[PDB]
Structures are given as structure tokens and as C-alpha cells.
Amino acid sequence: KRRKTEKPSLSQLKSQVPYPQIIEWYDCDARYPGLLASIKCTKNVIPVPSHWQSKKEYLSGRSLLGKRPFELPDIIKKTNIEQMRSTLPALDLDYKKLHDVFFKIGANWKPDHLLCFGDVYYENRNLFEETNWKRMVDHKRPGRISQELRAIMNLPEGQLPPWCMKMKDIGLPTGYPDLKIAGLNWDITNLKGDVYGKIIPNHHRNYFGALISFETPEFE
Template identity: 40%
Template sequence: MTRMSIAALKQQVARPDVVEMHDVTSKDPLLLVALKSTRNSVPVPRHWCFKRKYLQGKRGIEKPPFDLPEFIKKTGIMEMRQALAEKEEAKNMKAKMREKVRPKMGKIDIDYQKLHDAFFKWQTKPRMTIHGDLYYEGKEFETRLKEKKPGDFSDDLRTALGMPVGANCNKIPPPWLIAMQRYGPPPSYPNLKIAGLNAPIPDGCSFGYHAGGWGKPPVDEHGKPLYGDVFGVQGKDFDAPSADEEVERTLWGELESESEESESEEESEEEEAEGVEESGLVTPAEGLITPSGVTSIPAGLETPEMIELRKRKVESEMEGGETPALYQVLPERRNERVGAAMMASTHTYELPGRRPAAGAGGEGVEVALDPSELDLVDTDAMAQRYEERIRETQLEKEDLSDMVAEHAAKQKNKRKRQQQQQDDKKSKKYKEFKF
């Protein structure tokens, strides 16, 4: 009484197609169906609920022997093994016992190039199953429909239908052609071309109900084909391209010069301006009025008619034949001392428009003053404070340069020790080696 019915379960889930009759017996049927309908989920094999044991139906079926792949057969290993087996059978008992005591190696010797080509050039990928594709009993005997194509006849099918097999087998129509001419082509394959129905019949064949005849072509009361070009008169018209189509042969990837681009832009701007003037669009007088006291554009900031983005000076120089100065060589100045910076450079460049500040070495000196000392700016105390600051800066530079030199010396000694240790290890390695 408390168990949910199958109909009620199918109504409550999003995927009712995965519901099975035994799902209602679980503790939580809704969770079970949700797990079964999850993407990339693999179902439980169906034989869990079968009364018969797994693969018991294959008893008595002879299992085919293992067959080597085609790319391994090309190496000739099968012929070599067969010849070796025949040679072994021809030996007497004394030779076999002697072979057991002192076996000979290298009997099957295949060329290395053949083995390399077999596994790296001709190797084919084995047939594999996709994710979630489970094996069930009798699956290998099913027909793989992906390898079949509608309209193609195999030799077995032709033999079963009583149709000839050979070079001129396509001259005989299939037995269902008469019914298709009467009732129409199969609706599952609307684009399938069937000779005698919506495609012309082979050369040398004729319509009719005699032996080897292709029936009666399906036409309407005016003699026009019903399902396609059954007489083969429209093929040339359909295949030939229409002469009205003009193909543009100009190069589409060619770059335009700047002068042509500017001319095309000016022409497009003039065409747009003319189009706006000729269109006759009038600003609406009512309904779209700016509220009082609010202006969208402040005075003096009107939008210009044309904004020039190119450098006219460079273009004029290029048109005049003069090469514009694209760069400027900066004068280089060597520094004798490294200075206060940790990673300072030994040379600097003088930038135009910048002058070195006054002070020691052409550098400015920063002097901190309290608000109460602002009246000392033009006095001797200010000069004394300035000289003290310069002396402190020089002492800091000397101390920092000493620290940099000491650090560089330490790093040099460290690298020297490491290199020496590596050389000792190499020499020790070669000393210990004995042939």
C-alpha cells in the first residue's frame, strides 16, 4: 500500500524514459531515478535480475581462435613460425634432446626496419567501446548499423533475394522497386537516390514488367516525374552553374596605403553628410525637449566637425621626400662612483629639458625643517644646517659603497668555493673510475 506506482513515479521525475518496473521497490525511488538520469552515468548490467547465470546462453558456441592484427601479419612472423614448426617436426628424438641440452637462440630473426614500420607506421587502433557501453550476451553477433549504408547491396543479400552477383549485377532491379513506384519512396530516407524511382536507370536497361525490366516510372497525368529526375534529363541543368552569377576576382587581402585610406574616409564622411541632409529628418518639436535648467553640453565644449588623429607634420615631411626624425640620440655620461643606490648603473643619459639640481655632485640635498624654524631660511643657521646635511650624505654614500664592495667580495668568494668544490667532485669521479 505504501509503495509508489510506476505511473506516479514517471509523472514526478524529469526523465520518465529511464524508469523501470523494479525502480518502485527501492527505498527512495526519486533519488534512484535522479541518479540514473544524471549525465555520463553508467547503468548497472541488466543480467543482475536474470534467473539464468551470466553467459550461460553461450555454451556450445565455438569460440574463434585469436587472430593476429593485420599490421603484425605484414612482418611475416606467421610464415617464419610455420616454417620453424615444420622443421622441428622433421627432427628425430636424438636431435630434439640435443636441442634441449644446448638450445640455439635467434631462430626467428626479423628485420628491425620491418618491426619499426609495423608498430610505428602501419599500426591500427583497435576497436574500443564508448563510455557507458556495456557488454551483454550476444552483442558480438549483432549487426553494426554504422557500417551499413541504405541502398548498398552486399553479396549475401543479393544471394538471399535471388539477384545476380558479379560485374553486371546493378542491371537487375531490386524486388521492392515496383511497390516503391506505386506507393512512393521510403519516408525515413528522403535524400536517398533509387534508380527507377527518383533517379535514372543504368545504361542499357529499359522500363517494363519483363524479366530484368525496371517497372513503370512514377509520373502524373501530364507525364512529369513525381519523385525526381527519373528520366535523367535534369541532371545537366542542375549541375551547370547559372551564368547570371558574377564572381568577384579582386584581391581581398591587399593593404591600402594611407593616402587612399584618408581619401576613402573623406568620401565616406561627405556621403554621410549628404545623406543626412537629403533624408529630411526634422528634430521633433514636442515630446523630446531637454528639461529646463539641464544642458547636455556645457558652453564652450561644442563637438568639432572633424577630429584629426594623424600627425600632419610627419606626413608632410614624408610627402616632401624628407625622412622625419623618429628618434634622438641622448648624450651618455660616465659615473666614477656607484653612489648610494644598491643596483646603480655606471653610466647615465642626459635627458633634454632636465637640469641637475644644485648641490654636491650635481644632486639636490633635502633638509628637514620644523614649522618653528621657517624664519631661519635666509640666515647663517640655514647655511650651517645645509653643510651638515651635505656631510651626512657623503658619509652615508661612503658607508653604503663600502657595504656594496664587501657584499660583492663575499659573493665572489662564495662562487669561487662552489666552483672549486665542483671541480674536486669531477676529478674525484674520474679518479675512482676503473675500466
């Protein structure tokens, strides 16, 4: 009773904290709030996954209904057993082939997503969309437009995007100062296919561990 009503306000607790935004309303009933704020707000600690205080047993997810059953890592998919055995609703294989797939072909191979120091998987999360996202931030760059989005845009080949004219009056993108586009800052004769422009960088090892040779263990 008295101890329950003795609690300091969470904002009174914020001042003790160097990173006050992590502390939350429920920290008021922390039996040792001044300590718990220091631990929770300590540098490298990773806050408890928030699926607690929910009674849903951490997975009720509607998204769980729509998750793909599985996908082979493409290196293993090269092994062709996908066609040999149909998992969806005998296939003689070579020892050298499989062994080389894991070792010769797949030594340097690593899953593309993984996760980071403090990455924690909440129920509603799905990594796959973020994998295509990270891969997409990689492939796609300004000045280039795929033929699909080009067809939807109804832009014929050899013709500049509609924002090149408004970009002539307004100016180059503030975010891309080094961006070049045919007809304006960049040679129109170099206009080719899906690329109407490219960023021209103005910036222009061994890491003590350079192996200088790569030799995998041989099965034979």
C-alpha cells in the first residue's frame, strides 16, 4: 500500500537517466527504479522484447498465416535435388557435387540477412521484405528505371522522364548533387536503354589479413 504509493514519478526518474527516452511508464513500479533505469539505459544493453504484457503467447500473428513454408538457399538449390524429390503437393547425386556445393562453391557463402547486435524479432515482423529491401537499395540507383516501371509509366525508349523538364527549371535533386542526366549535365548520346543518367563521383589495403590464396578442403 504505502510502498505502492511511495513511487516517484517517471519524469522524476527521467532526470537520473542519460538516455531518458527508453524509460517507460511501467518503470514507476520498478522495485528499484533508480537502479533499473541505470541498467536499462546502460550503453550496450538490449531492452527486453516487448511481447511481454501481451497474453497472446507471443504468436497469434495474422502475418503467421501468410508466411512462406521455406525457400532453399540458392547455393543448395543449385544441387538440383529440388527436381529430384518433389516436396510440394532415386535422383542419383555426386559426392563431389554436394561436397563442393558446401565447401568449394559455398565456403564464402553466408545468409544475406542475418541480424545485428540488438535486432530482436517482434511478432508482426517479417525479415523477408526487409531482405528484398536491403537488396533493392543495392541494385536500384537513380538515373535508371526498369522496363516494367517504364512500361507502366508509358515512357518510350530514348525519351527522358517527365521530371527532367521540371528538373530543368527547378534544378538537380538536392539529395543527388553528383547526379547526371542526358540532355542536361550529361551527354545525351550516352543515353542507353533503361539508364538515362548516372551519378558521377567526385571523390576520385589488404587489411593486414589478406589471405592472398583460397584453398578449400578436398573430399578425395
